[PDB]
Motif scaffolding. Structure first.
Motif, short mmCIF file in Angstrom:
data_model
loop_
_atom_site.label_atom_id
_atom_site.label_comp_id
_atom_site.label_asym_id
_atom_site.label_seq_id
_atom_site.Cartn_x
_atom_site.Cartn_y
_atom_site.Cartn_z
N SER A 47 55.78 72.92 33.85
CA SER A 47 55.26 71.59 34.18
C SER A 47 55.10 70.74 32.92
O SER A 47 55.42 69.55 32.93
CB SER A 47 53.93 71.72 34.91
OG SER A 47 54.13 71.96 36.30
N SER D 25 53.82 72.33 41.73
CA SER D 25 54.44 71.13 41.18
C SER D 25 53.48 69.95 41.25
O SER D 25 52.58 69.89 42.10
CB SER D 25 55.72 70.79 41.94
OG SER D 25 55.45 70.49 43.30
N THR D 26 53.67 68.99 40.34
CA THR D 26 52.76 67.86 40.18
C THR D 26 53.48 66.55 40.46
O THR D 26 54.57 66.31 39.92
CB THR D 26 52.17 67.83 38.77
OG1 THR D 26 53.03 67.07 37.91
CG2 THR D 26 52.02 69.23 38.21
N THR E 26 48.62 67.40 41.52
CA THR E 26 49.62 68.40 41.88
C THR E 26 49.73 68.55 43.39
O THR E 26 48.72 68.70 44.08
CB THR E 26 49.27 69.76 41.26
OG1 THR E 26 48.43 70.50 42.16
CG2 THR E 26 48.55 69.59 39.93
#
Lengths: 93, 96, 80, 103, 103, 93, 80, 96
Positions: A47, D25-26, E26
């Motif tokens: 991320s 996930s962001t 998120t």
DNA sequence: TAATGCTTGTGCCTTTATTAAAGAGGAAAGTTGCGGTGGATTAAAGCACCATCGTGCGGAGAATACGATAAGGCTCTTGCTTCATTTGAAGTTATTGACAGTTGAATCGAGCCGCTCAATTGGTCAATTATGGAGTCAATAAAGG
DNA sequence: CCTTTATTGACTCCATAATTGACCAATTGAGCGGCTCGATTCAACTGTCAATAACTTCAAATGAAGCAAGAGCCTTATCGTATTCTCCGCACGATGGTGCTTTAATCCACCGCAACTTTCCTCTTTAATAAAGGCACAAGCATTA
């Protein structure tokens, strides 16, 4: 409710490596926690890499870079080799 | 002529360099060392000036902190001279 | 490039120790410090080059160094 | 219906790993299938390494089960795994070591 | 059109902080307005604390501008800020301190 | 492209605290980096808290808990007081 | 509750030092260790109680302790 | 009768307790101490048993590591006896 | 004490370079409206958490004799500091040439979203096998001789 | 070297508890289709990075003299250690009471999305003033007497 874990897959890996050696419940829980920690670290690094490069999609390149950043030395090299082999086999199928 | 007893000039430099904020390592040798180290990971690498400046700042800050810990270890052993064993102990306790 | 670690002269190491409060310095401390600095630079530069390679670049920027320092718990302020 | 793990030649679940990556996930992030395959491959490789070392440690002690003590021995006996796994293992103890000067 | 920062009595931008929080959420996360107000309030409070200490340090040196040296002095002179701000300040130097046994 | 920062707001805070004292560009950049680091820490802690409690929405409670976890002692107490005051003023207006 | 720090008896501290490879133990080491343990427990319990209060609970769970340990870089395996 | 020279039994317990994996602190006193410490943060707190077990495991692991660092510091000062100054030095180098 | 070299603090002019103040315009925050998801509320069951009781034995507390470790002092010798001379290489400035980073457009590869099937995974139960307990023997080390 | 004694590994057998294997559900992964969007490619171009050359002068290298700090050794005294005895409270087993945690259903409330406006923040430009330089000065310090 059902709590999802990695015990089945850890047992399969153990049977592949040591067919005659078993594992205790405490040790299996420790292994599951270790796998969760590694997955969390890899996801965090991926991320961060996606945010730095302004690329919203996480691909095998992000995972490879996260493995190189997180795992140390020869362990990282062998993990990258295994991941590349797995991805090549998956794509060839 | 005139001589200062050992330890007085050393204390003067301790006072002088603690008050300043300048960089202690020369820029060009540090840049050459950084390029030499980086050439082991990827050939034909280029460096921004700010990258080398940040590397130098971080390296000198780390070295100053390590020398502070080394001085603590040396004083622990009832000495004023820092030794490689002091650095080794400080790095071992730090986890390095 | 070779033997560039000797470019970190003994006066420079003495000045760094003086800033650290060190009053007396041994003879082997210079070689020990050179080795420690080489290890530290190896780690930071390895992480920075990994970051640079991910971005498909040949030039190492200050952002890569800052991220590499942050990864190792050595956060640096003054370069972004 | 062929599983993605079997397609990738893996034992770890590629689909579950993909789902977890998607949930991690962001801000409208996307996860490729190859990312999940790669993650599963590294997870399985690390599991295999740790389990192999732990099984060797267990065999050295003439037992047929892996315990937290064996995991601690295996992890602290390997430099790379010791660097990677800094967490505390409950019931693992410490590696037997006595300094020379204390003898 | 009255800004949310003035509504909350703040100098930091509540709207920009809300947008950053939204982009940092998120997997279909949601951010309330009060969360952005709270974040801006703590950010402005910490800025005010650090700037007050740095200004006092600058005044003690009889200068009319804040420099990285003054920020380093202010942060290392306060236990809470020293614990909170562990990063390296470029051009900050070290706090003048010599051990008793070396004198 | 334009790079967004906190310099204007830091300058306003400085003029509120020290009207006659300025700030250098390097010090302003350091302050901006420090604020970015604090915001990143608060956001990470808030996301972790949301994940732990299965609560997808981040509210002032999550920010308060993150401030209590991240900031030390009296600093955390005063920051929580300031945040509460700001939220109350925002809601009352 | 009072004087519960004395419940960490001297034999327990001696056993902990023996596991740590310590051969000889001073007499004030016990009080020093009690103080250090009290500080460590204060930090961990403060973080755990913060986590518990966020969840609107009155009972401190093992998950809260695990998260508190992870926050301080003291990750624990064997409790989830 | 029969007496062991000082340092022999100590080495025997060093060998014994390093091979084991049990907990060294009694459970009930540690639970009472944990409750006493926690009552300073929130009144009327209840503790799950696994929480106290995890707290004890972490506390003993931390104490064992700190004693290892303390022994390193004591050996550095040419001593076999660990002293509070050794614990203070180890904690200072660790950043505590 | 005390003179005297000496380094550092301190005052004043330069100037310069580093910050304060303004303009366009573009990027983004505020406003309004609506749909739909999520958080607050309430009730219920169950279990887990605490408090009580008996006991009984293993571990802790305390005292004793004492050995060996730590601290203090003395010596000496060698390793590190300080000073002076020569030099050689870092820093500055001016120049240039090309490599590489960055931006912008098209577009094709690929991941998200819906819905259904069904196969894998998880919780529960019976047991069998590896592990620990208890006891005696033998090998090892330790301490006085 | 020896001998006697305390310690611990090992060997055996038995209890036991902890893991393994089987079965029902439930849950989520895979399949297939449609659609939008974002990662790859290409290219222009400009920013800046590396390589060059000359000058300078300042910091580094080296050596000489010498001092004082570290290490070794000897002594002593005190303070941790090993052992024994008494006792006390932790741990185990059994029990009950309740409170608090988790889940499920409802509902409302508030946040995301979309489009438009308007206004606020962010490069670019120009002036200005605070501070580092340079030069001279004063004084607290260190050093030998």
């Amino acid at each position: 409710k059902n709590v999802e874990t990695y015990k089945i897959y850890i047992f399969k890996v153990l049977k592949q490596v040591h067919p005659d050696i078993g594992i205790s419940s405490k040790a299996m829980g420790i292994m599951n926690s270790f796998i969760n920690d590694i997955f969390e670290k890899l996801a965090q690094e991926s991320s961060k890499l996606a945010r730095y490069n302004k690329k919203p999609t996480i691909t095998s390149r992000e995972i490879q870079t996260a493995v190189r950043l997180v795992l140390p030395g020869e362990l990282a090299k062998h993990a990258v080799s295994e991941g590349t082999k797995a991805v090549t086999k998956f794509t060839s199928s | 002529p005139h001589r200062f007893r050992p330890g007085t000039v050393a204390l003067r430099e301790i006072r002088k360099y603690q008050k300043s904020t300048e960089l202690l390592i020369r820029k060009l040798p540090f840049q050459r060392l950084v390029r030499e180290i980086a050439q082991d990971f990827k050939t034909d690498l280029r460096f921004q000036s700010s990258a080398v400046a940040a590397l130098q700042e971080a390296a000198e800050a780390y070295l100053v902190g390590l020398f502070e810990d080394t001085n603590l270890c040396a004083i622990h052993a009832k000495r004023v001279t820092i030794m490689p064993k002091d650095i080794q102990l400080a790095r071992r306790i730090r986890g390095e | 490039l070779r033997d560039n670690i000797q470019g970190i002269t003994k006066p420079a190491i003495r000045r760094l120790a003086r800033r650290g409060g060190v009053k007396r310095i041994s003879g082997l401390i210079y070689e020990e410090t050179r080795g420690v600095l080489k290890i530290f630079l190896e780690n930071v530069i390895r992480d920075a080059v990994t970051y640079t390679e991910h971005a498909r670049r040949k030039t190492v920027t200050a952002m890569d160094v800052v991220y590499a320092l942050k990864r190792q718990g050595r956060t640096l302020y003054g370069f972004g | 219906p062929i599983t993605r793990s079997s397609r990738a030649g893996l034992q770890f679940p590629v689909g579950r790993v993909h789902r977890l990556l998607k949930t991690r996930s962001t801000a409208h992030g996307r996860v490729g299938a190859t990312a999940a395959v790669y993650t599963a491959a590294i997870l399985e490789y690390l599991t295999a390494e740790v389990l192999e070392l732990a099984g060797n440690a267990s065999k050295d002690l003439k037992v047929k089960r892996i315990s937290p003590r064996h995991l601690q021995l295996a992890i602290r006996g390997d430099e790379e795994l010791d660097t990677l796994i800094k967490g505390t293992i409950a019931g693992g103890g410490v590696i037997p070591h006595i300094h020379k000067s204390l003898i």
